[PDB]
Write a protein that binds this DNA or RNA. Structure first.
Lengths: 150, 362, 152, 179, 150
DNA sequence: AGACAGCCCACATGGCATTCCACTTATCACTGG
RNA sequence: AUAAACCGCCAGUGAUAAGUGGAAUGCCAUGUGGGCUGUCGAGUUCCCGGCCGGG
């Protein structure tokens, strides 16, 4: 009973400007709980079940970087795309890994805004739901490696 | 009578960033279950050493280097007036255990504290031995006999006597290695802290269509507990047999700095030039740290400061009554939160507290 | 009796939850006015009641000042009548007129603005006391109809 | 060294909701928006190291330094960032300015760690906090440095080891002449 | 498609103090995965070949005994050189074998530090990639027979 | 009920220690095809 | 219905006693988030008493 990531992506894409923007305004991820448009968006995807909602929160907050910074295409990891941008410096990715909980989601969103990244969305999505233990390390690995091929 | 002097300080800084790590993040630390903002013992120590208060009241700080080439150049100037160069060079070589040939770069095992006065005295000894046609090893044997003579040179440089020296290679390995008289703890916040992030811009006067740089910086306000211990017999020893009054003098100077000195970064952009709101000093037989008062991270009521001082007093009451401590104690505070345990004598001004430590808790 | 009740969050989200939760205070007819909503402890509420409310595990009671009514005609009083006008009256004139219909019968209004009605009225005394006991208008079990008097 | 200015008191920010009205569509708005904003009583602090200033100018005189220092006091009391001033217009002058010479730099920010509670506004109790705390710090740490204060409204007097300037220009003159 | 042991050796010798030190701090082999300088060092040598990385991890960790305890020259066995040191007692080696997986790599590194051994590196590298009951056994046998020659 | 921006931009430098140390003993079966 | 059929390798047993990983150590200097904006418009819906009035 997983979260259909691509379905969520298209649902986000299909939102009316009022709601897409209404959610874009959120500064921190937990503030998503104050917006009705959040509840409406998440509602098909199972936010009703606890320990589905933290994931859903992170996924939406990362989409709310807006407007369409997350562009979907073995799969392409978030670390990979952050390197493929070439705009992002290693030190920032480090701060993301080292960052405490809410701050880490925030700085991540900031990175997404900066990178206009080309990922494989559901992969990054999954990675976001289990975020993150290995995942942090894993993204570091991907970033450094992709950045070093170059 | 009592050998340990405990210094407890509660100090509140405004938004600032007083210790960064490799990632220019604040220095986190976890206690007992919550993140606390941390200032490293090392920063505190060097802040006090390098301080103007110290320069005025203690003297010269020590010279810490790993580079022996520069060192030999310095020593060549100063003691070059006082001793022959061949003698100086040799003194450095014996103490160092490393060969001091004119070569551009000569490196010690590790970064080490040096005192010029000390080296001068060693130069005197090497002069005596060399003229007397004494062998180096024999010289070492003789110098081993009276350690204190080597330690009074410490009085000239006190930070070493406070926090100690380590040696691996020289004659220094044999004679001049010192235990720290003062043990100090990294300061931590009394309460939980989630670090704020400031988002900055560098505006380029020559590009109109944007900023030249965008960035982030971690910062926090915090109420910090600083703790420090001075072992008194140890301090007297490390100075070459100085009296309790000299010791206590150094102890108060340390109290003053411990209440007054704040690390330098990034003070020019955040300017947390804050004084201590609470300073408490107790004499004891065995050292005591009140950090456990804040194991329950203090929750803000009318700020963090007041309930923190409250927490401190209450814990100290519990500890002092539980373990039956009957040591001399005085507390000076800026806020009107009074101490529970008499006898904690209440000092209206820091200078009065300081004079009280000098008079040994009266 | 004038009570100061706080309803817990899980039991004050909906308005019918508010009515039921404030009904459950009487194991032994009332009117309620909401001061503040959605605080972490829930709804902050001023409560006028026939009987004395008993503290439930969802609706805590902070204090209970009983009242006995001493009104004199001619005396000026501030008033907050939280109420709801309909036939839904969107015009300002219509709202004020509505007020001064009920209150016009009992006690003349000297100033007012808007729905929470804040203003100053002057006073027949028994007619007005009676009216306060009765409540004013629609939704008496939805939070409206509670008039509170205050002396100048 | 200058500090980020902080409000003396707790602030819950208001949110203003924009509408951009399109002259070419008669029914709806063309744009909707939001903006955070607050009113606030702010504490500004800054420290000038004089020896350093003299050094940085290549051995300039104490008077040149003080000259620059007075200029700073003025700006610190006077200058407000430009945004979003054209739409909110907070062109406010300082209600309290205090200048003291000392051996070690000192920030009075701690006067407001207990977030100030509104009594007759925030300004009055802010000045209250400041002054009482100044009294405490000054007597406790036994500093005896030259200090002068100019304010539009004292309540509040500090024990008078602070010379009181009725006008800012006089304060500036006091700093230029070094207390 | 093996790992060029000698090229890797030289690569470790060529590292900046920052990285020689950055990798030396590591307690367990997996923590290497938290180091970016690790990924940079290893990646040409066939990291990013899943079936290669466990081996690569071990090799680097043993080098990470530092600073230069492993000194290279029919070939010289690790067992042989460990005995040739004369510092190491048989019992300790037995313990190396008797310990479970991650522990065994840790313990070995401790041995290497103590022995300061003169091996044939690429050999030791081979033995280290195929690390297995047999390889362990051979370590014992070479050790005892050598320590007995002496 | 209806509607909810856009652009542009994201740092560099240098530095990563040493000394010395790493067990020993007693003891390892017999019977039947 | 096979060099097959039937067809035990069994029994007893502490791995034990001793042991600081330790001494020294600022992460640090630089930085506007900034320019534009009526919330208008509007009367929406569950039962009983002659638009009005009670839950």
């Amino acid at each position: 009973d997983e979260i259909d990531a691509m379905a969520l992506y298209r649902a986000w894409q299909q939102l009316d400007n009022g709601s897409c923007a209404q959610i874009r305004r959120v500064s921190e991820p937990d503030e998503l709980r104050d917006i009705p448009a959040f509840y409406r968006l998440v509602q098909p995807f199972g936010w009703e079940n606890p320990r589905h909602q933290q994931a859903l929160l992170r996924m939406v907050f990362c989409l709310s970087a807006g407007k369409n910074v997350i562009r979907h295409q073995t799969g392409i990891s978030l670390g990979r795309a952050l390197a493929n941008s070439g705009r992002i410096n290693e030190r920032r990715i480090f701060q993301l890994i080292r960052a405490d909980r809410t701050a880490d989601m925030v700085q991540l969103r900031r990175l997404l805004t900066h990178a206009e990244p080309v990922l494989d969305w559901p992969l990054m999505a999954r990675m976001l739901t289990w975020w993150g233990k290995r995942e942090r390390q894993q993204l570091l690995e991907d970033f450094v490696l992709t950045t070093n091929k170059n | 009578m009592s050998n340990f002097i405990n210094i407890h300080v509660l100090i509140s800084h405004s938004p600032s960033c007083l210790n960064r790590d490799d990632m220019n993040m604040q220095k986190d630390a976890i206690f007992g279950g919550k993140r606390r903002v941390r200032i490293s013992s090392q920063s505190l120590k060097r802040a006090m050493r390098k301080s103007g208060y110290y320069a005025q009241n203690i003297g010269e700080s020590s010279l810490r280097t790993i580079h022996l080439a520069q060192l030999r150049d310095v020593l060549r100037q100063k003691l070059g007036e006082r001793f022959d160069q061949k003698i100086i060079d040799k003194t450095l070589a014996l103490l160092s255990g490393k060969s001091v040939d004119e070569a551009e770069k000569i490196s010690a095992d590790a970064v080490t504290p040096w005192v010029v006065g000390e080296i001068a005295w060693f130069c005197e000894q090497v002069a005596k031995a060399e003229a007397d046609n004494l062998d180096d090893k024999k010289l070492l044997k003789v110098l081993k006999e009276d350690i204190a003579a080597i330690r009074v040179n410490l009085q000239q440089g006190v930070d070493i006597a406070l926090s100690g020296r380590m040696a691996t290679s020289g004659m220094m390995t044999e004679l001049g290695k010192v235990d720290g008289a003062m043990s100090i703890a990294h300061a931590i916040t009394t309460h939980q802290v989630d670090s704020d992030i400031d988002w900055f811009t560098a505006v380029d006067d020559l590009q109109e269509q944007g900023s030249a740089h965008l960035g982030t910086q971690e910062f926090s306000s915090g109420v910090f507990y600083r703790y420090a211990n001075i072992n008194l017999a140890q301090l007297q020893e490390n100075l070459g047999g100085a009296s309790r009054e000299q010791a206590l003098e150094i102890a108060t100077h340390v109290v003053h700095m411990l209440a007054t000195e704040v690390p330098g970064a990034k003070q020019r952009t955040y300017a947390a030039f804050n004084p201590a709101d609470m300073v408490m000093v107790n004499f004891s037989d065995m050292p005591l740290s009140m950090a456990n008062a804040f194991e329950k991270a203090v929750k803000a009521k009318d700020g963090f400061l007041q309930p923190s001082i409250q927490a401190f007093n209450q814990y100290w009451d519990r500890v002092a009554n539980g373990y039956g401590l009957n040591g001399a104690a005085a507390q000076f505070s800026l806020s009107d939160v009074d101490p529970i345990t008499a006898q904690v004598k209440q000092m209206p001004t820091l200078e009065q507290l300081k004079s009280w430590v000098r008079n040994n808790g009266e | 009796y004038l009570s100061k009740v706080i309803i817990a969050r899980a039991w004050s989200r909906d308005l019918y939850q508010l009515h039921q939760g404030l009904w459950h205070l009487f194991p032994n007819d009332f009117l309620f006015h909401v001061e503040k909503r959605n605080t972490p402890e829930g709804c902050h509420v001023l409560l006028q009641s026939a009987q004395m409310p008993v503290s439930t595990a969802v609706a805590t009671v902070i204090k209970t000042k009983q009242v006995e009514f001493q009104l004199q005609v001619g005396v000026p009083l501030y008033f907050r009548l939280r109420a709801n006008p309909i036939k839904p009256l969107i015009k300002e004139a219509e709202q004020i007129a509505w007020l001064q219909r009920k209150l016009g019968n009992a006690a003349r209004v000297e100033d007012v603005h808007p729905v929470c009605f804040e203003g100053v009225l002057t006073i027949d005394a028994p007619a007005l006391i009676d009216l306060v006991q009765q409540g004013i208008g629609p939704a008496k079990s939805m939070g409206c109809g509670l008039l509170s008097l205050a002396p100048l």
